[PDB]
Amino acid sequence: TYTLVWKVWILAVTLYYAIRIPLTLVFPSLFSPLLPLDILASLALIADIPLDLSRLPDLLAALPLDLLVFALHLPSPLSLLSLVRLLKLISVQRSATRILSYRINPALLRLLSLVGFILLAAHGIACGWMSLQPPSENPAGTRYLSAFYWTITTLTTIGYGDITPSTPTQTVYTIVIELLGAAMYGLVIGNIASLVSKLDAAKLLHRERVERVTAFLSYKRISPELQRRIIEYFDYLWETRRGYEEREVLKELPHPLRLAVAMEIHGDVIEKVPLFKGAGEEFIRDIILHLEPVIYGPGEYIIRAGEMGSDVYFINRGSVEVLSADEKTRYAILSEGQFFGEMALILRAPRTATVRARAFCDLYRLDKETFDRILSRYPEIAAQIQELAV
Amino acid sequence: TYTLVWKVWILAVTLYYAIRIPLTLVFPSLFSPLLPLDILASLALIADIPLDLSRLPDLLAALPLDLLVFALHLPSPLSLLSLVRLLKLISVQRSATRILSYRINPALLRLLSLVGFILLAAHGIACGWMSLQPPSENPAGTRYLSAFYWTITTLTTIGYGDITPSTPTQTVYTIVIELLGAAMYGLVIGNIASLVSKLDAAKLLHRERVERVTAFLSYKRISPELQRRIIEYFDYLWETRRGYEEREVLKELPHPLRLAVAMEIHGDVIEKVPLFKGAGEEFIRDIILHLEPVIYGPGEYIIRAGEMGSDVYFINRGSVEVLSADEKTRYAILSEGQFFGEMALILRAPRTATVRARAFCDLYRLDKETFDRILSRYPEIAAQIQELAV
Amino acid sequence: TYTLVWKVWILAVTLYYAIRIPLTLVFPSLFSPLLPLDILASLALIADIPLDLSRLPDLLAALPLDLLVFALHLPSPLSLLSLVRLLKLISVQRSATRILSYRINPALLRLLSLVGFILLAAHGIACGWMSLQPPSENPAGTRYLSAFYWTITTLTTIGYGDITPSTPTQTVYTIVIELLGAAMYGLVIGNIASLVSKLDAAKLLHRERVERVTAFLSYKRISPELQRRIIEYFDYLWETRRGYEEREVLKELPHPLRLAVAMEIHGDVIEKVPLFKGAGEEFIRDIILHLEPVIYGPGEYIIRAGEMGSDVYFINRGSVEVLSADEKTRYAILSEGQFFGEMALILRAPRTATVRARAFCDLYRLDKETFDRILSRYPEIAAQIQELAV
Amino acid sequence: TYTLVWKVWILAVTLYYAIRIPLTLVFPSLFSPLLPLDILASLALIADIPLDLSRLPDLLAALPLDLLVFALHLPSPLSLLSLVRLLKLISVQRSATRILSYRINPALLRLLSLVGFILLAAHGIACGWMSLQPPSENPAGTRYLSAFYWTITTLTTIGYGDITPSTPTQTVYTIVIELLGAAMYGLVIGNIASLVSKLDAAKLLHRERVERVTAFLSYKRISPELQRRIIEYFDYLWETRRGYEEREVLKELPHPLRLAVAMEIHGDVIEKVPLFKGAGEEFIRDIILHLEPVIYGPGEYIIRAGEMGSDVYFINRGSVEVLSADEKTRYAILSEGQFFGEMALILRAPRTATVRARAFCDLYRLDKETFDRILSRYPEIAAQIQELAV
Ligand SMILES: Nc1ncnc2c1ncn2[C@@H]1O[C@@H]2COP(=O)(O)O[C@H]2[C@H]1O
Ligand SMILES: Nc1ncnc2c1ncn2[C@@H]1O[C@@H]2COP(=O)(O)O[C@H]2[C@H]1O
Ligand SMILES: Nc1ncnc2c1ncn2[C@@H]1O[C@@H]2COP(=O)(O)O[C@H]2[C@H]1O
Ligand SMILES: Nc1ncnc2c1ncn2[C@@H]1O[C@@H]2COP(=O)(O)O[C@H]2[C@H]1O
C-alpha cells in the first residue's frame, strides 16, 4: 500500500525522461528553466537502488550522467551518451510484468507495453529526424509536428510521400527507421493475432466436440430423433456449466479442497437421510467422495419398476417424478435435496416404482459395490443399518 | 418469432443513426425534410428499455438528446455530444453475439461485426475530414466521395498520397486516424489469421498422428509391407469416420444417452441370437454396453482353427468369410448383422473353423471374463444358457 | 490413370477462360482468329456433366453463354454476363482439394490456390481498369502493362501513387478494389501465419516438456549431476525416436496391427529362448503383447546381485554387460537379440550376478505376476516349464 | 572444437560471395584488385565436399564457375550464371538448423535466418535495379544508395513513390519484386506471430484452468470463503512450482530415473525412521516409489483425534503443528524432514492427537493397503516391524 506510490513515481520519472531528453537534446534553448524538477527527479532515480536492495540497467541509469553535458558543451557525435538512462524502461517493464500481470491478460499487458514503447520510440525518432535537418526559420511547434507526422507515416507502413529525404544521411536514417518500423509493425500484428486467437476457447472447444460427435453418429446411420436429443443435451450443458465435465474439473484440486467442496455441496442433503440421522462423521466423509454424477434428459428412464436395481440416487438440481408400474397412477413428485431409491442397499430386492425424469435432473448416483466396500470396515454403522433394515 | 423483428428493427435504426448523424452534423442544409422518420425512430429507440426490462449505454442512448441541437444552434466544439447514442452499436453487438452466435462460427461473426464497424468508422471519419476542410464551391457528392476515398486509402495502409493535409489541424487529424487505421488493420489481420488457423483441425490432427506413427515404425526397422498395410488402414479410417476413435468419442455422452446409442446401434443384432430369443431385457441391457469394437483389415486372421478361443464377435458393417482348418474348403460366408463365434462361451472348447476377413469388418468383440462376470448375477439366464449348451 | 488427364484438361480450359474472357471483353478487335480452339474448349466444358454423373456452378458454366455476344453486339452494362462460367474455378478448387490434397500439406495447397486466385483476380482487375479509362492513342501492350502494374501496386498495399484516378467512377473502382486487395492481403497473411505456426510441432513439444521437467526439478533442489543425466537422456530420446513415447504411440493401432508389429519386432528374439524351443504359438502370442519397454542410461543398475528379483529382460537395441557381486570380475558381455535374467520365473530365488548397462539399452521387461497369470491357463506349457526348471 | 571454426569460415565465405558477386557483376571496374582473397575463398569452397564426405547444391557451388567470366567477356543475358554458387546459403541454413538449433528457440533461429536472407536479397535486388538503369554521370556510392533505399521502400510495403519506373522493363522488374516483397513480408509477419503465440504457455494454461474451475464453482453456488481459499491455493501453486502437478510431471521419466529422483528427494527422510534404522535396502526402494503427494492449505485438518486413521505422513517442505483432542494444549511442533502419524500401520488403532497445518505443507502420504501389499512379501522386515510394534 506504500510501495505502489513509489512504483508509480518511478514509472512517471522514467516516462518524463523519455519525453524530455531527446527534446532538450535537439533544442539547446531548453533546460534553462527546468532545473529543480529535473534535480528532484534525478534524486528520486538515484534513490532507487538502496530501496530495491540484473542490476546493470539500474547501475547505468542511476548515476547523474546528465546535468553535466547540457552546459558543458561537447560535439554532437559524442553527445548521444545522454540516453543511457533510457534503459530504465526495460526495468520498468520487468517490474510491471510482475506487480500487476495477473489482474489482466498477460498478452494484453504485453500489447499495451509495446504500444507505449511505440509512442516513445516515435517521439524519439521524430526528434532525431528534426535534429538531422537543414536549418531554417520556422516555429519549433510546426517543425516538431511535421517530424512526428512523418515518423508516424513511416512507422505505420503507409508512406504518403509528401515529404522525402534529400541528403544521403537523411536517406540512411529513413532506411534504418524503415526497417525498425516494419519490425515493430510485425510485432504489433503478431501480438494482436495471438490475443485474438487465445480469446475464444470454451465456445470453440465445445463446438468442436459437438461437431465431432454429431459427425460420428451421422456416420453410424443413427435416428434423427436421438441426434436432436443429444444436440439439445449438449446445448443445455453449454448453457448451464459452459460445457465442462464434472469429474474432469474436480480433479485439479487436492484431496482436502475436494473434500471441502463435496461437503459444501451436500451440506443440504447429508442431514436429510431418514435411514441415518447422522450418528457418525467418518462414514459420511467416506461416502460423500464416492458419489458419481450423471445427467438425465427429459423423458429418460432412471429406474424401471421390474428391474433388479442396486443404486441409490441423490437429487441435486433438477426435479423428478415417480410413476407406478403401469405409468398411469402417479405416486409422488420430488425436487432438489430430497433423494429416492433407498430400498436398494439394505437388501437385494427388485424395484417397486418406475421413476421418470421431467426436466434435466443433475442428480448424483451411488452404486452398491463401493457402498458395501466402504461400509464393511465400519461395524457399528453396519449394525445401525441392518437394525433399521428389518 | 415475434422478437426477431424487433431486434432487426433496432439494428436497422442504430445503423441508420450511424449513417445519418455525422452526415447531417457536417451538413446544416439537411434534416429539414427528415422529421417524421427520425421522430418515429427516436420513439422506437426510447421504447427499448421497457421491453428489455449493463444499462448504461441504453440509458445514454435512449433519451432524445438529438432533435434539439439541430435547430437550437450552438458552436461546433460542444456540438460533438450528438454522437452519444452511437454507443447503441455496442449493445447491438452484445445482443447479436448471443441471439445467433451458434448458427455460424463465432470467429466469423466477430470478423463480420468488425468489418461493419470498419465501414461505419470509415464513413464517420470521412464526414469529419470533409467537415475539417477549407470552404470551397464544389458539389457535395464529389466532396464526400473524395473524403471517403482518402479515408479508405489511409485506413488500408496504402497511402497513394495524391491529396495531403496542409494545415496543422489536418495533420493532427491524419496522425490520429493513422494510428486508428493501423490498429484496426491489425485487428482484421489477427481475426483472419485466427479464423484460418482454426479451420482445418481433423485433417491436420490425423495427418500429424499418422506421420508420428510412420516415423516411429521407420525408426524400428519395420518391414515396408506392414508400413503399407498400416498406411492403408489409416487412410480407410480417415475416409470412413474422419479418423475418430470409437471409445474416445463415445465417452462425452452420459450413461443414458450412451445406452440409447448402443441400443439403436444393436437394434438389428440383439434379436438375431439363436441361443437366446430375448427372454429378458436386463441381460441384454447389461451385455450391450460391454462390447469392445475392433477393426480388422483385409486378409487378417480373426480366429484360427486350432487356437483356444474365448471371445464372440458381432459383425456390424463389413463382410467376413469362414474357412476350414486347411483353408481350402470354404464353409460359409457372412455379412453384417449375423454374428459368429458362439461356440466359445457355453463351454471351454477349442475353435473349429478358421475365420478370415475379406474387407474391412468394423466388427465388435465380446470377451469371456466380463460375460461371465455380468452373467453370474443372473441365475435364470444362466440356467437358460446351460440348458441349451448341452 | 485415365481421369487425371481429364482433370488437367478441365483445369487448363478453366484457366484459359479466366485469362481470355476479360481480355477479349475489353478488346473488341480480338476473338476474330480464336474461333476453333474456343469451340473445342466449349465442347470440352459442356462434355463435363455427363462424365461427372452442388451442380449449380456446373450448370451455370456448361452452357455456351459465350460465342453469341461477341458478334451479337449489346451495350457494355449488360455485357458483364460473359463471366458466369468463371465460377468453374470454385468447382476446380473443390475437386483439387480432394484429388491430391493428401500428397502435400492442406495449408500449403490452400495457400497455392489462393495465390493462383490472386493472380487471376489481378489480371481481371487490370483488364477492368484499362477498360474504364479515357480513350487514347497508345499501344495495347503498354496500356495493359500499366494497368497490371497499378493493380499489383494497389493489391499489395504499397501505393506508389505515380498514377491516380481522376474521374469519380475511377475513384469508386479504386475504393472497391482497395477493400478487395486489403481483404486478400489479410487472407494471405493469415494463411502464411497458420502454415508457419503449424510447421514445428515435435521439436517444440519436446522442448516444452523438457523445460517443464527441468524447472520442476530445479524447484526441488535436485543435484546438478542428476539434472545433467536427465538432460542427456532427453537429448538421446529426441535424437533417436524424436521424443515419442513407446506405449503412447503404440495405442492408435488396433489389436491385430499391434500384434503384427510386436511379432515383426520380436521375430529375432522369440526363437532364441533356451528354456523353450517354441512348442506352441498361442503362448508366444500371449506373452509378446505384455512386454513393458524401459530405457536404461549409461551406468544404471538393472539387476543387483543380492536383491530378490522377479523380472526377465529382453535386449532389443543396446548392449549390456554382466558383472559379479563384487564388480571386479566380469562374467560375460551381451548384445541385442540375446536376453538375460531367465533365472527369475521358474522359482522364487535371489539374483546371482549384478547387471550394469554400458550404453543406452532400449531393453524390454517382462514381470512375474502377469507371466504367471497368462501361463496358469496353459497347463502343457506349465509342465514343459517346470520339467526344465529342475 | 575444431569444426566450429570451419563452419564459421564457410558461413563467412558464403556471405562474402552473396555481398560481392552482384556488386562486381554490375560493376566491371571491380574485381581487379580482389584476386588473392577470392582465390583462397574459392579454394576453401572447393575443399568442402571432401571434408563433408543432398549433394546437389554443394556440387553446383563447389566448382570454380566464377573467375572465368569476369575477364572472359560475354553478353549480359547469359552472364547471370555467376549466381549458381549462391545456393550455398541453403546448405548453410540446413547445417545451422542442426549444429546450434537447440541453444535457442527454433522459431527465433528461423526468424533470424529469414532476416539475413531478407538483407541479402535486398542487396541483390538493389544491385539488379541499379544495373537495369539508363547510364548517367554520378558517383557509384549515391547510385547504390538510391537503389538500396528504393528496394527497402518496396520490400517493406511503404511505397514513398519519390522515384518511379519509366521504361517497361523497369516496370516489370518492379512488379516481380513487388510480389516478392509482399511474399517475404508475409513470411516475416507469420514468423513473428508464431513466435509471439508460442511464448506464454504456462502462465496462460494456469490462468485458463483456474478460470475454468472458478466458473464451475461459481455455477455450483459455492461459498465465497472457499472460493478465496481455492484461489489462494492456486496462486501459491503457481508462485511455487509454476502450476505443474507432481504426478503429471514425474511420468515422462522412465523407471530408473524416477527411482533416482525419489531417492535423491528422500535421502534426508529415509534415514530418520525411529521404527526402522534401515536394515534392508530393497524394502526402502519398494516403499519410496509409492508415496502419494498431497498439498494442505493453512488451517486444514490433516488428522483429527477421534477418527480411525490408517495413513502415515512424511513432511517434506512445510511446517505443521500437533494439537490435542480439545485443541487447547499444544503437544509439539514439527518441521521438514521429521515425519508423524507412525502409530497407524503397526496395529489397527484410532488416532490420538489432532494435527493441524499452519502454512502450506507439501507433505507426502503413504496409505495402509499398499504398505501391507508391499510388506507381505518381505517376512524378515515384517518380523522386525511387529517385534517393535509390541
Ligand atoms: N409413495 C412413495 N413416496 C415417495 N417415494 C416413493 C414412493 N413409492 C416409491 N418411491 C420411490 O420409488 C423407488 C422405486 O423403488 P426403490 O426400491 O428404488 O425405492 C423407491 C422409492 O425411492
Ligand atoms: N457351417 C457353418 N456355418 C456357419 N458358421 C460356421 C460353420 N462352421 C463354423 N462356423 C463358425 O466358425 C466358428 C469357428 O469356431 P467357433 O467355436 O468360434 O464357432 C464357429 C462358428 O461361429
Ligand atoms: N556366466 C554367465 N553367462 C551369461 N549370463 C550370465 C552368467 N551368469 C549370470 N548371468 C546372467 O546374470 C543374471 C543374474 O541373475 P539372474 O537370476 O537374473 O540370471 C542371470 C543371467 O541372466
Ligand atoms: N508428544 C508427541 N510428540 C510428537 N508427536 C506426537 C506426540 N503425540 C502425538 N504425536 C503425533 O500425533 C499423531 C496422532 O496420532 P497418530 O497415531 O497418527 O500418531 C501421532 C504422532 O505422530
Chain C neighbors of B207, CB-CB under 8 A: 102, 105-106
Asked if A316 and A339 count as a contact pair (C-beta separation under 8 A), the reply is: no
Phi/psi for D248 (5° steps) reads: -85, -10
Chain A neighbors of D295, CB-CB under 8 A: 254
- Cα dihedral sign, A140-A141-A147-A151: positive
Smallest CA-to-CA distance from A277 within A388, A117, A112 is with A388
* Dihedral-angle region of residue A234 (phi above 0 means left; psi in -120 to 50 means alpha; beta otherwise): alpha
D55 CB neighbour count, 10 Å cutoff:
11
Is A130 marked as binding a ligand? no
- Rounded to 10 degrees, the C-alpha dihedral A150/A154/A156/A162 comes to 60
Element (H, E) at D89: helix D88-99
Residue D323 one-letter amino acid: L
Q: Name the method of structure determination.
A: cryo-EM
Dist. CA B324–CA B330, nearest whole Å: 6
Q: What residue in B sits closest to A223 (Cα-Cα)?
A: B264
- A388 at B interface, C-beta within 8 A: no
Q: Exposed (0-12), middle (13-18) or buried (19+): which is A362, by Cβ within 10 Å?
A: middle
Q: How far is the CA of A278 from the centre of ligand 3 (A)?
A: 62
What is the length of chain A?
390
Please indicate whether, in this complex, the C-beta atoms of B157 and A153 are within 8 angstroms of each other.
no
Smallest CA-to-CA distance from D189 within C78, B124, C191 is with C191
Best mutation target among B150, B194, B196 (most C Cβ atoms within 10 Å) is B196
Grid cell 454476363 is found at C81
Residue C333 one-letter amino acid: I
Dist. CA C357–CA C355, nearest whole Å: 7
Dist. CA C390–CA B108, nearest whole Å: 75
Q: What residue in D sits closest to A263 (Cα-Cα)?
A: D222
Grid cell 531393453 is found at C363
Query: Which DSSP string corresponds to A153-205?
Result: HHHTT----SS---SHHHHHHHHHHHHHHHHHHHHHHHHHHHHHHTT--HHHH
List Cβ neighbours of C170 (8 Å cut-off, separation of 6 or more).
C132, C133
Dist. CA B258–CA B264, nearest whole Å: 10
List Cβ neighbours of C290 (8 Å cut-off, separation of 6 or more).
C366, C370, C371, C374
Grid cell in block for residue A73 = 558543451
Asked if B265 and B335 count as a contact pair (C-beta separation under 8 A), the reply is: no
Dist. CA A234–CA A70, nearest whole Å: 71
Q: Exposed (0-12), middle (13-18) or buried (19+): which is A21, by Cβ within 10 Å?
A: buried
Asked if A280 and A381 count as a contact pair (C-beta separation under 8 A), the reply is: yes
- D64 at B interface, C-beta within 8 A: no
Selected residues 227-286 of chain B with any CB under 8 Å from a CB in chain A = 240-242, 244, 249-250, 252-257, 260-261, 264-265, 282
Dist. CA B198–CA D179, nearest whole Å: 27
Residue C164 one-letter amino acid: T
Smallest CA-to-CA distance from A356 within A389, A379, A380, A324 is with A324
Grid cell in block for residue B283 = 441381460
Grid cell in block for residue C123 = 489480371
Dist. CA A286–CA A288, nearest whole Å: 6
C-alpha angle B343-B348-B353 in degrees, rounded to nearest 5? 40
Dist. CA A268–CA A315, nearest whole Å: 11
What is the length of chain D?
390
Grid cell in block for residue B263 = 441400443
Asked if C214 and C229 count as a contact pair (C-beta separation under 8 A), the reply is: no
For residue A77, what is the DSSP state?
Answer: G
Residue C366 one-letter amino acid: L
The span from the first CA to the last CA of chain B, in angstroms, equals 66
C-alpha angle B342-B343-B344 in degrees, rounded to nearest 5? 90
Dist. CA A143–CA A126, nearest whole Å: 10
List Cβ neighbours of A72 (8 Å cut-off, separation of 6 or more).
none
Ligand nearest to the CA of B324: 2
Grid cell in block for residue D109 = 533461429
List Cβ neighbours of B368 (8 Å cut-off, separation of 6 or more).
B310, B311, B344, B345
What is the length of chain B?
390
Chain A neighbors of C161, CB-CB under 8 A: 161
Pocket test for ligand 2, best of B351, B352, B354, B363 (most atoms within 8 A of CB): B352
> Radius of gyration (Cα) for chain D, nearest Å?
36
Distance from CA of D168 to the nearest CA of A (A): 23
Ligand 3 neighbourhood includes C216 CB (under 6 angstroms): no
Phi/psi for D297 (5° steps) reads: -80, 175
Best mutation target among A149, A164, A196, A198 (most B Cβ atoms within 10 Å) is A196
A170 CB neighbour count, 10 Å cutoff:
15
Nearest to C190 among B193, B295, B307 (CB): B193
Grid cell 575477364 is found at D71
Element (H, E) at D334: strand D332-334
The span from the first CA to the last CA of chain C, in angstroms, equals 66
Asked if C91 and C17 count as a contact pair (C-beta separation under 8 A), the reply is: no
Asked if A39 and A32 count as a contact pair (C-beta separation under 8 A), the reply is: no
Alpha carbon of C356 to those of A139, C309, C322: distances in Å?
85, 15, 6
Per-residue burial over B358-371, b = 16 or more CB atoms within 10 Å of its CB, e = otherwise: eebbbbbbbbeeeb
Quick one: three-class SS letters along chain B?
CCCHHHHHHHHHHHHHHHHHHHHHHHCCCCCCCCCHHHHHHHHHHHCCHHHHCCCHHHHHHHCCCCCCCCCCCCCCHHHHHHHHHHHHHHHHHHHHHHHCCCCCCHHHHHHHHHHHHHHHHHHHHHHHHHHCCCCCCCCHHHHHHHHHHHHHHHHCCCCCCCCCCCCHHHHHHHHHHHHHHHHHHHHHHHHHHHHHHCCCCHHHHHHHHHHHHHHHHHHCCCCHHHHHHHHHHHHHHHHHHCCCCHHHHCCCCCHHHHHHHHHHHCCCCCCCCCCCCCCCHHHHHHHHCCCEECCCCCCCEEECECECCCCEEECCCCCEEEECCCCCCCCEEECCCCCECCCCCCCCCCCCCEEEECCCCCCEEECCHHHHHHHCCCHHHHHHHHHHHC
Adjacent-strand bridge partners of A91: none
- D164 at C interface, C-beta within 8 A: yes
Alpha carbon of C76 to those of C17, C26, C82, C132, C226: distances in Å?
19, 10, 11, 11, 81
Nearest to C242 among B153, B215, B226 (CB): B215
C202 CB neighbour count, 10 Å cutoff:
15
- A33 at C interface, C-beta within 8 A: no
Dist. CA B356–CA B370, nearest whole Å: 25
Q: Whose CA is nearest to atom 20 of ligand 1?
A: A341
Dist. CA A64–CA B326, nearest whole Å: 98
Cα–chain center distance at C88: 29
Residue B309 one-letter amino acid: G
Q: Whose CA is nearest to atom 20 of ligand 2?
A: B341
List Cβ neighbours of A189 (8 Å cut-off, separation of 6 or more).
B186, B189, B190, C189, D189, D192, D193
Dist. CA B1–CA D283, nearest whole Å: 74
Dist. CA C250–CA C257, nearest whole Å: 10
Q: How far is the CA of C259 from the centre of ligand 3 (A)?
A: 30
Which chains are within 8 Å of B by 3+ CB pairs? A, C, D
Residue B330 one-letter amino acid: R
Strand arrangement of the beta sheet that strand C354-357 belongs to: C301-303, C354-357, C320-323, C332-334
Q: Whose CA is nearest to atom 19 of ligand 3?
A: C341
Cα–chain center distance at D257: 22
Grid cell 504485453 is found at A110
List Cβ neighbours of D148 (8 Å cut-off, separation of 6 or more).
A175, D122, D123, D126
- Rounded to 10 degrees, the C-alpha dihedral B235/B237/B242/B248 comes to -140
Please indicate whether, in this complex, the C-beta atoms of A168 and D196 are within 8 angstroms of each other.
no
Using a CB cutoff of 8 Å and minimum separation of 24, what contacts does B268-275 make?
Answer: B268/B337, B269/B314, B269/B316, B269/B337, B269/B339, B272/B337, B272/B338, B272/B339, B273/B339, B274/B342, B275/B342, B275/B346, B275/B385, B275/B388
Alpha carbon of D33 to those of C333, C355, D24, D46, D335: distances in Å?
65, 69, 12, 22, 79
For residue D80, what is the DSSP state?
Answer: G
Dist. CA A301–CA A321, nearest whole Å: 11
Dist. CA C113–CA C111, nearest whole Å: 5
Strand arrangement of the beta sheet that strand B320-323 belongs to: B301-303, B354-357, B320-323, B332-334
Hey, is A365 helix, strand or coil?
strand
Dist. CA C20–CA C30, nearest whole Å: 10
Asked if A130 and A26 count as a contact pair (C-beta separation under 8 A), the reply is: yes
Dist. CA C281–CA A141, nearest whole Å: 94
- B152 at C interface, C-beta within 8 A: yes
Smallest CA-to-CA distance from D189 within D158, D159, D156 is with D156
The span from the first CA to the last CA of chain D, in angstroms, equals 66
Breaks (C-N over 2.5 A) in chain D follow: 53
What is the length of chain C?
390
Hey, is D302 helix, strand or coil?
strand
- Cα dihedral sign, C274-C276-C279-C281: negative
Hey, is A152 helix, strand or coil?
helix
Is D267 marked as binding a ligand? no
Dist. CA C324–CA C305, nearest whole Å: 7
- B193 at D interface, C-beta within 8 A: yes
Grid cell in block for residue D342 = 507412525
Q: What residue in C sits closest to A189 (Cα-Cα)?
A: C189
Dist. CA C192–CA D193, nearest whole Å: 10
Asked if C217 and D261 count as a contact pair (C-beta separation under 8 A), the reply is: yes
Per-residue burial over B317-346, b = 16 or more CB atoms within 10 Å of its CB, e = otherwise: bbebbbbeeeeeeeeeebebeebbbebbbe
Distance from CA of A244 to the nearest CA of B (A): 10
Chain B neighbors of C102, CB-CB under 8 A: 207, 235
Grid cell 482436502 is found at A256
List Cβ neighbours of D268 (8 Å cut-off, separation of 6 or more).
D337
Dist. CA A303–CA A339, nearest whole Å: 13
Q: What residue in A sits closest to C190 (Cα-Cα)?
A: A193
Quick one: three-class SS letters along chain C?
CCCHHHHHHHHHHHHHHHHHHHHHHHCCCCCCCCCHHHHHHHHHHHCCHHHHCCCHHHHHHHCCCCCCCCCCCCCCHHHHHHHHHHHHHHHHHHHHHHHCCCCCCHHHHHHHHHHHHHHHHHHHHHHHHHHCCCCCCCCHHHHHHHHHHHHHHHHCCCCCCCCCCCCHHHHHHHHHHHHHHHHHHHHHHHHHHHHHHCCCCHHHHHHHHHHHHHHHHHHCCCCHHHHHHHHHHHHHHHHHHCCCCHHHHCCCCCHHHHHHHHHHHCCCCCCCCCCCCCCCHHHHHHHHCCCEECCCCCCCEEECECECCCCEEECCCCCEEEECCCCCCCCEEECCCCCECCCCCCCCCCCCCEEEECCCCCCEEECCHHHHHHHCCCHHHHHHHHHHHC
Residue D41 one-letter amino acid: A
Phi/psi for C308 (5° steps) reads: -70, -65
Asked if B332 and B362 count as a contact pair (C-beta separation under 8 A), the reply is: no
Dist. CA A268–CA C304, nearest whole Å: 58
Dist. CA C24–CA B107, nearest whole Å: 41
Dist. CA D100–CA D11, nearest whole Å: 14
Distance from CA of A204 to the nearest CA of D (A): 14
Tell me whether strands C332-334 and C320-323 are parallel, antiparallel or unpaired.
antiparallel
Asked if A259 and A212 count as a contact pair (C-beta separation under 8 A), the reply is: no
Smallest CA-to-CA distance from A286 within A381, A374, A368 is with A374
Query: Which DSSP string corresponds to D117-186?
Result: HHHHHHHHHHHHHHHSS---S--HHHHHHHHHHHHHHHHTT----SS---SHHHHHHHHHHHHHHHHHHH
Grid cell in block for residue C156 = 499489395
Smallest CA-to-CA distance from A93 within A109, A74, A73, A80 is with A109
Dist. CA B340–CA B323, nearest whole Å: 13
Q: What's this structure's resolution in Å?
A: 3.6
